[PDB]
Amino acid sequence: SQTIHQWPATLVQPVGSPLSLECTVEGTSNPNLYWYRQAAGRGLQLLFYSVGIGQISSEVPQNLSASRPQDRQFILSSKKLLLSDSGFYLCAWSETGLGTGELFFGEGSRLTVLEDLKNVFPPEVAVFEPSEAEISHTQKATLVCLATGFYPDHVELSWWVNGKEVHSGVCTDPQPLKEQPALNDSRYALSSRLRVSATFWQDPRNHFRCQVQFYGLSENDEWTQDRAKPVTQIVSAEAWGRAD
Amino acid sequence: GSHSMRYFFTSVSRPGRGEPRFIAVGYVDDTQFVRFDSDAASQRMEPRAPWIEQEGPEYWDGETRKVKAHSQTHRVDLGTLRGYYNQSEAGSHTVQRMYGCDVGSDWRFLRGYHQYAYDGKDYIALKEDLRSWTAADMAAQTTKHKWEAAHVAEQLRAYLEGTCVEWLRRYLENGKETLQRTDAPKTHMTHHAVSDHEATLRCWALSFYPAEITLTWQRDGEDQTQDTELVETRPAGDGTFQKWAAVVVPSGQEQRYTCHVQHEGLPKPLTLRWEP
Amino acid sequence: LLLGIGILVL
Amino acid sequence: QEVEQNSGPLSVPEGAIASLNCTYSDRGSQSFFWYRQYSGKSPELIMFIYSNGDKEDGRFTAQLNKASQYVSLLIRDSQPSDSATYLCAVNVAGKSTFGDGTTLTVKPNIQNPDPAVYQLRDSKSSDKSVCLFTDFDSQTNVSQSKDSDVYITDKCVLDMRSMDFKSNSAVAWSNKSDFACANAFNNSIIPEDTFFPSP
Amino acid sequence: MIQRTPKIQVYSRHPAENGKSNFLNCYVSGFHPSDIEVDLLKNGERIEKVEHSDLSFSKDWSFYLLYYTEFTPTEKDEYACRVNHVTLSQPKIVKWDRDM
């Protein structure tokens, strides 16, 4: 019934580029609509509040602007993004008026603004095979996936066994580490493990894939480097079951 | 003294002259302290008594934000009600909302109120139990079922017994010099009696606050003349109130009749008689 | 102070 | 500050009651919220409260005291899956004002600790390999290396729902030959007890 | 739908005295709907500088408004309130009686 969608989910853009975030609600009418930002921590700064179509209340002097061209359509924009516009942008609605005041959030828009696209690298991905020792000690098999040398730090890692995404047996690091903690622009690494029974790893009909979705440049971004353009892409690595 | 805080909201549709006219006023007892008018330039809640000016920018931003959400509720409501009552887009219609709380001389909660009217008639009202609704007709019963399902009465109870009484108490303190004043009425007497057998005596009460007053005419004893002719208490416009009451007597029996003025700010009940 | 809850459409 | 909640991280054992607290300064506030936020995700309402007292909904109890100006959330029987950032919010001035969040970690209860370090070889070359420290209990902490070109990940909670088995894992790897699994972890390892196979 | 005919009182803020600036008040109450025409008259002429209270209403939902202007009363000058409302078949003129 009631529904709030925001788009895009993730953006990597250069300083000086324009911004357009969209938000759509279905299954209610005349909602209160809100733009919040989560930056430099958790907890939410109100940027814009709209009590109704055409009505925008700006809650902080800022480089951004909002509009509401229809009832169920809320837009956040900038002509010229600053480094400091990086954040997690959340659209929310509440029932017309002043009820309980419950907020329904969209799935959010993660914006990274970079001084220089030159530092953007997708992940290299490698799968490491279970230790024969672990299988002998535990009758369990742990596969490890390494995503390395990516920048900036938003990747979504998933595990696929026989082309079905799994969740059971999986744990992925919550944050990536810096390959050089000293360097402000360090590339990043992320580790995941998939644990299965020793007899599931031994069955060679079984196909293990680690998949890393990377968010990078768009088609129309300018690119001056030798190497191919580090756009949004999926990097995978694989392994089959080994009875041996 | 007992005290009250009240907010009064009026929205009037005006098809082909754009958005509903919306007007909100807040009162403490008989003193207005805020208002919002959708047709004024500010588009802000604005002060109307000196003691509310003490409140900082967050108060005014907040009350502005909330009064506009009330206005937006009435806009939807005017549309909904044209539907419930099967009405054209041609007519002007009025929605009204009143709410607030009374406290006793101990400044503790006595009573909560939240009421709605359409075209000058009762639509839906919160009962004194602050959980039951009175619905005037079939249309208001739809509203009643929707407001029961959502526990609107429980939300209002929290404000009426809590928030409303403590912000009333804050206003009565910050506005102590205005709101807890008691201006005794300056009284006097007029004789405009241009009949042969009959005289008419009006007994005046000017510059009093609050507006609550009693103007009994008495005779030899009894205490009553069911024939008194008293005008509605009226604003002087300076923040005080005016009233008079009239009785028709014989031209002889001038000084057998007594005006019994009663006001909170009078030590003893006054008692006036025709002095030549 | 105005209500900040209990205000719903009819 | 309008809405104040401790940052944490607040650590609570699996099966114990987590206590989250929040104070607000504006006596105009008329309802009160706890939102839960998983890393990467948007906030999701746990519950609201607008009446003094307790409100229970399964494992969660909100408490509101308008005299003290505090909102609490109690989580009975805490699970690792309750690990999240908990956002306190106050409806005042016709909008929701948020606290800066309390991060909660529910440490899992490891029934049958079996601490081991394993070498796993790349399914492209043997050359590149990683070290897996695994099956240690939640009292073991894992330290970042005293070495560039050695990478060590924090511990991570892995759940084979169907087996009824939880295990803790950390991973270490180097861009170098100099590097053994033998001694990868410059941290408080489980003494003799940690199993180091002979590759 | 109810409509309610306004009650009209016209009076001074302070007791009238010729040569003392005062306030002329026209108080219209007990009416519905809220759209109303109120003009203060100086010898049958409309006075241009006239302010009014914020729209408010009684227990029974009927509206009230105070219209006011400062004036210096005289022996000579005649003041009135001219009120029209959909409930009035024609504009109603109530003259200022210095003793009412």
TrEMBL record, chain B:
Q: Does the keyword DNA damage apply?
A: no
- Localization: Cell membrane; Membrane
User: Residues in domain Ig-like?
Assistant: 185-271
Q: List the disulfide bonds.
A: 101-164, 203-259
Q: How does it sit in the membrane?
A: Single-pass membrane protein; Single-pass type I membrane protein
Report keywords, A-Z: Disulfide bond, Glycoprotein, Immunity, Membrane, MHC I, Phosphoprotein, Signal, Transmembrane, Transmembrane helix
Question: Its GO biological process terms?
Answer: antigen processing and presentation of peptide antigen via MHC class I
GO cellular component assignments? early endosome membrane; ER to Golgi transport vesicle membrane; Golgi membrane; lumenal side of endoplasmic reticulum membrane; MHC class I protein complex; phagocytic vesicle membrane; recycling endosome membrane
Coarsely, its chief localization is: membrane
The record's comment on protein family reads: Belongs to the MHC class I family.
Protein name in the entry: MHC class I antigen
The gene for this chain is HLA-A
